[model samples]
Target: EGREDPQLLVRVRGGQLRGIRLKAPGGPVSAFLGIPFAEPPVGSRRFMPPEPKRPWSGVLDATTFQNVCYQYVDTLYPGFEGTEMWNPNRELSEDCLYLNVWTPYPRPASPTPVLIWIYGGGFYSGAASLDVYDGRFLAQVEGAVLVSMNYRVGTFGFLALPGSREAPGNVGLLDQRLALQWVQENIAAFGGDPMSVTLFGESAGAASVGMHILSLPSRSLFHRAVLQSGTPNGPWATVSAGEARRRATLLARLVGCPNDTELIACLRTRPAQDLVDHEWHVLPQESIFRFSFVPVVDGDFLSDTPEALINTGDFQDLQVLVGVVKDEGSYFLVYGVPGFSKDNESLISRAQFLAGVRIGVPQASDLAAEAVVLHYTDWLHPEDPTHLRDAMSAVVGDHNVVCPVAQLAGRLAAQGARVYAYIFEHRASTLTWPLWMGVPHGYEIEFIFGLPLDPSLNYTTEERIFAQRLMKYWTNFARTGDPNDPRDSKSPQWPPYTTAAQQYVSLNLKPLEVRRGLRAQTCAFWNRFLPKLLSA
Candidate 1:
């Protein structure tokens, strides 16, 4: 508030604020960081739907990034390699319901399309201010307004104690909706079009966007969505309300609390870091994804399972761009497996088979599960000794991410929704993934944002081209619900997806052309026959 130029100040619903400007390659961009979108979910407010912050009087300094929603130090949690890579030096707190805005310099005469980023950490750990999510590159290149926000993760954000008003589920989803509401009301100040807002995210954040598309009340919050490597229909996205309550109860017991009310009070009294650290060990052990804390069907924000809703054609009609990397689940195979090789293929293969069966169809019989392993592993191929992990990666990736994503896209397209799909296979040098990674789960995130997750790594000219091309497709979709500019002949014309032929854009190669059968056989095995085999 002090020593601020009048021109740098902006008035929002809560109060007046000022942010800093940064130099971008194209031009300077205004960055308003750490603007509160909701009251801090602290104390009695814990586990409840976030309430709007009270209006403030003085000019609030919107300069520094706010405290990250309470989470354990990144290395402390399981499967947390990329979650805290961005802004690793930032502080963490329960008071983290803040949003950041990056707008092109000199607010456009007309409103610019807005892209809101929701980060993914299995819905347990992530912050909007991560170095990977810096919106400046996308903002300058696309001339679009970019926004990212923090929501509670882990138990603080998603504890569901059935029949307890204090701990209803989906508060995390509600946190996202509240942030969207904030953008809808306040984004024009940053020269962003509320009506043209596009919600995009990777992993859990992408799942959140998919959930919002199905949530009745959230339909108006965004006009388009881009789901990358994740979807609500994926087995990990939503849990049954009964199981949610049971998990919350188990956590309460593990933390030495007696009842719902006492659990709430005890958790509120405990240190945030302790709870975050403790939740990792308490997460579901049966699943390799370790989605310990996730959203549940609250009969509110999410009234039903995404599969059920999609089957009935109940979700909102909006343009969607859904995709998966060639090896979407390789991240898990790389990090989740312990002593992870074929030296113990006997044990490793069955364990992976059981995990996939649990995700694809929990009711699957031992015999059926064994068959799954046989089918995916190709039964004693000479390649097993060398490519055992790769073999398992295909099984896990298709079941956990690829299969469900294609099913969701197909469902929407069958109903005549405008859907476009892509498969990212650009395993270029400097992409920071293993040479064998083969477009592993999140490789495309770096290109989409035009920056390496690690600042020390240098981006090559080829990487820059990939980055620029992806930004064009992404921002183009944000602009008009179509990721194409026919006038620009050099650019690829991404075809809309449909169930007829399973067509999709194949990235990472010259002359981007429509490709079909991206996962034809794998998806068929997972979606069509897996359930019947399990159910029988």
Candidate 2:
């Protein structure tokens, strides 16, 4: 290793930090890792909103990643190595409210646009230090500042005691809000434009981005957002106040504490590991997509349901880009359901298919379930188990991600928001999943971060090209609220989504295709018909 570069030293409100320089495909970049944005949420601070980090005395080492937030480690599948890639590889702790920054080395004369990333792990697991989320290439190539933060997850982040002021819900989101405030105040030191911040994330992180857009207090924190594979209107995104209170009490009782009076107090005294170990005890099912301690509709942070908030056009001012993978639910299915595999050909039977539909759309009545089954059934082989399995995956995808994303994009467009949408249909050759699984949830992340550029991964020439193009689209939107780069004319022009056209780009390895009305009939069934069915 070479001597630390004096040029990489930067001063912020938290004091001085020295970063390391790294070589990227585009150019050299400086990475400042493990910078704390909030005071350690330990002891009396457990389950509480984050407090801004106090200033440090000396130059802090920012060359390496810090501890990830406390969370349970579990293999997504018994033998599949690909799914395990997302598990936090660092030490877990309650004091894990740190953020990382990456910018071009030899700081640019002009401030660069800021792209803040929030990782997704169903709101219970994820870290900024994950190899896939490394910002070196993206920062250098896109000529922008990239930031990612480690916020509290699981019980430490989201456990809520309804009306109790001490444990008011959504501290996870509050942690993110505090991080945004930190960015607004300190990003200029890192050569980032505070006013040009574009918040982006995948899965639960995307949901968090949507939450920030809807939240009255968080709207000014970022000017634009890119939501990949998630929306706040997703059934799994938010919990009701009553449900939040119930789970909080259940968790308190699980640890041998009285749920009546000193619930939050008793929980505060329990070991952090015990809280993670028992978090799933609050869940009604053990599905991979199911989460118990997610964000709540806390009056202060989330004033109302995401749907209600969107209907009021609370987020109409924000320019947004939202989309999902082609087969978003396949990843959830393989990990969530036992003995459901393509290699073994153990696909869902007719009975299991219907059950899957109801499980995905929990509010569906018997008649509605029948209608859904008929709507999604493959007429050519309606009784075939394989056909039924594909149908079930479609239903799950529509209910959990596709339909919600379509609705969010449409509603945002209707409310006069400049919206861009896409469907990621390109599956990387590096993926170990069966080809029939299609492009599973979050597969696009590798390309987004320019992971294919790493020679060790053995990606193809075309794959690297695809990654470069994808990064340009993402960074272009962050820079100008539009995916098309004015500097480059080779890339396809991504059209703005509107109610009349309902247009979106089909992102694939082949020539990018602009399509109209993505999954229109299926979304109509979920967005319009299902709500009426629930009411009836």
Candidate 3:
């Protein structure tokens, strides 16, 4: 019953483009999809930094989505469909450096603040055209511009050569920076305020936001950031330059290429699938929260590790909103090792847990790793040894998301930077086998995007109320730094992040109260005890 609006044309620096109008509650919002932001990273530009696109002469029809960047399909578990969470749809290619925008107007009465999203897939796989991430509903409801972009991933994006010109690391991060620069120069055509940009992401995307915060070269790209369930300081978020090269060498050898000058040529000539097929085996071990190809501490893009930057205050001064789910690691722990499900609790015997900590923990000795296992084991269930499975979730979640998030928030808040932190405890409307795996990872994305797991499902009275409040908090923060502004009596009073002790929002609790010290005991175990244990 709806038709495309003819007046959806606009002139950008690269070319003339036309978008289509989407029917909205108030009016028709415009959808500008698949606009090129950078030149394709192929041939000579394969592992190089992103280059600006040459301007086009004709009007580019910015309607359909382009192919997603080349990467292997995610097969989460051996036989599981894994379709509900991340079923991506697109042709794969190197020519996938494009972006999508949803706005209320091609020209507005005033410039609206923009929310640019960076999708997360552990630095290996993700695309901007996923169905769950549609921006039209959000743009229409929140009254702000929404944007998503695609960047290179896997070996092509993060491979590090030995300081040579052929393969410097962090090209994926550079691709993101280039997109931000494109927005600064061109977003005004879509009625967006370049100065009021808010960059937000979840998981790997969140870590990318953290990198941009620490990156001195990328300071002016955005004014504020929101990181959900990931941080640069997470144990698996970075690799040393030497380790990066070691992995690259192994990958080259896997593809039957010698680690010589011809290595880059051999890889470039190989199909993209060949590079991605070897990701899981890129490292020797299988751990709960491990990434083979990740950001490295290069002198240029990242001056040092996130720990050094945070301690020395080398990051940008910007408003921040950071948080995590209650059980951020259960998603991985349940399927972390193929045959080690909770059905056999002894499958993860104390020795196995201890050995895993040694691999995952950066500086922990064998003795300290034993202590971590024992500490988490104390919370095990009295009736069933399988309850140790829940304890494992706590250990992994704290190490991977909780403690680092609190560390980052505490560091910034201690320095008096404006920060708002929260813990999302909203249970899934959908039920599951691991019922005790409370509020597992990625549940917040449903609430954040106003998505329901069951599409035919009618919302419960309380769920509807909470959804409205959650979106308000997010969109309000994107509009202004403070999430409690432009509010009504129904909106929860979210306090600014002043201290980890007294200032944090607790979402979707039975009474929906703002809490003090959510997961305080476990966090103290990680922050206070683990540091001393590691140094010893």
Candidate 4:
């Protein structure tokens, strides 16, 4: 159904470049989705960095979706793509290196501020162009330009072979670096201001955003950054170059690669299906999980952790917005359900055991583990099974989401950068399923994107006000470097991000209560725990 309505463009999908009419705004706009920003990272070009996309013979149709990076797609999406449920998306492949853009007005009368979204799923999963991630709403409502892109994943993205001097590990991180560089150079064509860019993401994307803020290579790519639930200090995760290589070698043998470059080239050129089928697998409870394609401590792209970089003042002068959901971990704890539970227990072995372990005291391991689960039972609520599930999620949140968020905020405050911290207390969506997962991992993205709430939340008056206020603050920040300017129409009187009050703007919560050391008492537990792992 190709319409010759002056907007016919051909693009590739399922291995064929076909004609498509891109549905967009401003009287049915035009689009160029699935366009390659870099050369296919296959064969000889594999594992080094993204090669530039070659020129096409004619006008390449830029509509329709593209494949995702090589992954254990079946395992990656598991329950939905795995056991039951439903998720219809592209099968994984090497041509996964594509980007998507939406422009209400690509011609900058206002130099439309930009929001480059980074999808998150523990780094090994997610993409730029999921149907749920259609950027049309953000572009249309927020009056800003939007862009999303996919990079290599799993082995293709994070692989780092042993003793390979040419390229250190963390290909995924490098891929992001490469994408940002391209955006810095070319986003204006899509009506986005190259200068005013906001790097935003949740979970893994949030962590990656956090890392980029600290990266030397990322200095000129973006000015403002937002970390929704970015916590890089997860246990039994993260890979060094040596670690990346050890796994890459095993993969090479499985894929039949004799040398480092050969494995990369061979991996790059392999059939996308073949790559997905062989590489994707589920993680076990205690195997130390070595096979994810995420940004690692690649000596080249990312020298070390954010804590390490931040402590040394490596991050360039950049304004930051970092926050977490009230119950940041409910979503993650959904992995598997518990077998039993009890509200009342006196000197129970299980109770004592858990407390000790959580405290990291070997002799008191059991006590720590039990105490945490025991007291956490009341503090987190056990009758509401959802609350218990949230307790597990909190484990992830405190380390990865809460503390790191507060840490980044505090550090930025110390550094004299315009910083804003938020604790998203927006209640669980009363709409439907998942009952009360308490502001799930990426729940706030829609609000940030300016999409209407689940419609069922009956969003309170305060929630509505919060959403409106946030978008204005966000857009204002993108428009001008200073978000505190009163002349801006989007917001009311605001103060600078100063350490005097340890000021931070709250999102989806009471804005007036914003103050220094908001999470001080609770946050201390994490600050002590994190540095031991995150420090250089």
Candidate 5:
């Protein structure tokens, strides 16, 4: 046990753990890296719920990140430029189930609330410790526990096949549940309040959070939630056993496998690169078929519907902080920048709408025409006649991402939960992203933790003030359900969510009241027309 050897304990430093040492804000904090939260999911454990991970005897080091979850190193997309397939050095493996943590004080029993962040890559690509989501800000700056995790992506995570009994449909969700249980049991060792856990994520991560909240098994593991960008009701996707089975059979045929079980087994053994390259483009191809490796309604992990459960105030006791940006759809365009022009119109007009751009779980999203604009228009030329781009994205940003999540917030508010909302309007240019990437998708993440993007981009007093203001709101929500702590006098009188005024606390630019904003109409569009689309 780490109790025996302080040197062997798992902790994070500069986002990579391994008995690493550095001068952090909270003095000299030590950390363990890459600790396993569950038993190996290889061999017999494949496709099943996570089994308890045993404590290592020889003081296992928690430094170093693991391989990308059961996936191929390289993937194929129509416009994916500068692609690097698997460098045998960094490909997929079964030893992929692991979690990383960061702690401020050594073995603190203060029971600091733990914030577990789930990365967003549409349930396919992302890391437990993205360089940008560094936990130092949370631990060193905010004096709280920070945890980030990696789960199965692509075929390994969600492939459901006919005639297959070993692997279930939504293995990725099960993996998340397993990690939650582990945190519940052992997070305190890292100065985390095991009881005060907040599960937060953006986009696909938010979708996963929405589903997990509704999962019968995920009831109390997390006390609070922060849903960013996407909601279960928005871009909703969960395949049934039958539909999933059909897709699995197709995947097996593509890789030359016998039956469903053989297909899943073969998938595990096959190179993640081969699978990722092929399966990577499958979901975008939903314009054609229903064969996408999205989470399935496996009758267990994701048995019941999330929107319905939330509608009935299922997690009414849990506090929520739901938010979205003004230009939410620009993320799709700016994700892999430089491939397209930064110029607004050129980015839009050059977009090529080839055949079908299949969106998985259309039932969860009535955002069709807008979805197309969000996905297609960015790469097109500005002068191109079809440059009616940003409007569709605005609707999509609202309907697919913003409104649906706000609907979830509305449902929570109706049931008597303390909910706060925000809209990021901060427009800043950093070296990493394009200038137009204002409040686009994950920009708020850096600001939320009050962390600097690059040393070159020195933050001014206002920026520091901005950081403190935002970070306090975030850390407070983590420490307790109330986000009304005073980080600065500039902070507004942010009120709890109420149907009476439908007020949402705005972040960035200037914090102000946002009542009956776009949320009203967007949520209405989602409530009436969205579910039928995602469930379809």
Candidate 6:
């Protein structure tokens, strides 16, 4: 029964592709893997926007994953079992602009809603073929077509050189845009409705979704978006064009290329791994929150800062569901900071906490950093090291992801976009972190992908049910703008978010509940008070 189905043979822009049939919890599904959406970005094509893939002569095999975009594996997580699943197990290459799709077996009677996933790796590293990103279960169980794509990352994706036509910056974003365009043109062939596409992602991928929402050229590509744990306005998401160029130049020099008029030409000649190896050389230190190469405001793709664009309502009119986990910073604190490692028993001191505030919120002035510490600190138990550690985690979480997502949700709702917000508080039993690190970043991905349904992992019954409910919520939003529509009695009614109401759903092991004003005062301090303090 799992043999290749005749219905799995689909024709797209390039040529015919024969996909394989795989068994899922709901039933069998057709998986089309490694379909090239763009021409290989090699040689002179490096650092440029992706070109449409040319048609091939014969029927192509789309049963297996292709090469992942070049990236340093250890740079993401070294000797950490928790994040081992996120690592790319495939070979790496520059010819890695491939996308994968999973559709219901025997084909749906009507075109199903399409959910396109963009992965997050802080704009430096990620791959579509990661075990954690498998789309078969999500596609089969949710009754929708699921797709994920591989795009350039690190130096190859974001090396910016202003005023040069060769590398105009944000080609990584352009790569995503090209994939979206490819979906719009070809998803129909695979039983997916092009007009009902929903773009969703985590961390940098969520930021990419936000940037697409803000971009004029990308407005027509997707109809809805789900941003998990990141926004375009996050301080770490985008760098100034000048700063991007500086990093690119520094990277070139580090790779033995001289900084001159021929910088782009010289970079094109270097090995791809050499470029990836030196990506972090541009950064000042080994902070997890900071990144070297990131998207820049290249006049064409992004006309202005995300804040300015949102203020002026210069974005697409699409339904949005945005959110963050409760303890987003704990993941970074445990893995990124020295003393907070799982084996370390030492507690954080006030001085260490204050220094953490400054490092977590890198853009803050000394006065602003002190102000943040004062705001987040527990005055009642200021001497308690555990309390101090918790406060530090909150500080890192607020500045890096939580506050930015809240601010974007408010702005989008104010600008007349239908927005739904959430706070994921459900801690999976599979996590390897200590009990204190509750629902860290990227924790919700497994549930959304319905990984718990696989009996081999032996997830708790509650977790398996929770994952099913989450799949329903996500696919519901993809099909209908309202997550609560097509009404599942199991899920709570998720209210529309606004500046005044600030309503959001709390996803937890306990019954799903609606909440108001998530971390309201803390977000206010970061979004409203901190900006004014920094400016003053």
Which one is best on lDDT? Answer: 2
- Model 3 lDDT tens row, 388-468: 555666677888899989888877777657888989888865534355666877667766766542245454666756765
lDDT of all predictions, in order shown?
0.79, 0.86, 0.77, 0.59, 0.63, 0.85
Off by over 4 Å in 4: 1-30, 74-88, 162-167, 231-237, 249-291, 314-316, 340-390, 428-433, 453-467, 482-500, 509-518, 529-536
**What RMSD value applies to candidate 1?**
3.2
Question: What TM-score do all the candidates reach, one by one?
Answer: 0.92, 0.96, 0.91, 0.78, 0.82, 0.96
List candidate 5 stretches off by more than 4 Å: 1-18, 72-92, 107-109, 162-164, 284-291, 334-344, 347-387, 453-461, 486-490, 512-515, 529-536
Which has the higher TM-score value, candidate number 1 or candidate number 3? 1
Candidate 1 C-alpha lDDT tens digits along 201-317: 999999999999888789888999999999998678988888898788877777767567877888777777667656856555444665778999877777778888888874346
Model 1: CA > 4 A from native: 1-7, 76-88, 314-317, 341-364, 379-383, 452-457, 489-492
By lDDT, the candidates rank as 2, 6, 1, 3, 5, 4
Residue pairs whose backbone atoms clash in candidate 6: none
lDDT of 5: 0.63
Runs with alpha carbons beyond 4 Å of true place in candidate 6: 1-4, 75-79, 259-261, 284-286, 314-316, 488-491
Cα lDDT over the full model 4: 0.59
Taking all chains together, the TM-score of candidate 6 against the true structure is: 0.96
Kindly indicate the candidate among 2 and 5 with the higher lDDT: 2
- Candidate 4: 10-residue stretch with minimal lDDT: 339-348
Better of 1 and 4 by TM-score: 1
How displaced is residue 292 in candidate 2, in Å? Answer: 0.3
